[PDB]
Amino acid sequence: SMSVKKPKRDDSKDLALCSMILTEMETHEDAWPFLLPVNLKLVPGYKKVIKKPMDFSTIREKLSSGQYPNLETFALDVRLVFDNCETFNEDDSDIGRAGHNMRKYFEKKWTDTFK
Incomplete structure (x- = not known):
């Protein structure tokens, strides 16, 4: 609240790290x-x-x-990409499977990088 702050989590590398994750997603074969x-x-x-x-x-x-x-x-925004894919594509299609794989891939990198 006013003049009462939780300790400052270091966010100065977030931009670079999101860029790295995004690169890895861009270069995945199922992208x-x-x-x-x-x-x-x-x-x-x-x-x-x-x-x-x-x-x-x-x-x-x-x-x-x-x-x-x-x-x-x-x-x-990343999750939006996968949520849209699930909205429009059957699970048992190449694109539907691509989306599930990519989401899994993303979520692991996200956890490992930040949590």
Whole structure:
């Protein structure tokens, strides 16, 4: 509360570490569905159904331009990518499986880096 602060967690490396994680996600073999924004002209249903599209390139641009205020808002966008994928894709499809694998991969790196 006012003049009563929890001890300061060191956040000065967060930007660099999120960039590293994002690099590892970009270079995973199952990243291909997620590298670029879904083409809303060419994919029926996507525009209406997925209220907040997100992809790794868009996260990378936001990261690079100071549009994440903290490491939680970064994690929310990454998870959004996987939540959207589950909304639109059957679990038993190549893209559906890609999404589950990538989420698992992300969540481990996240825990190991920060928790």
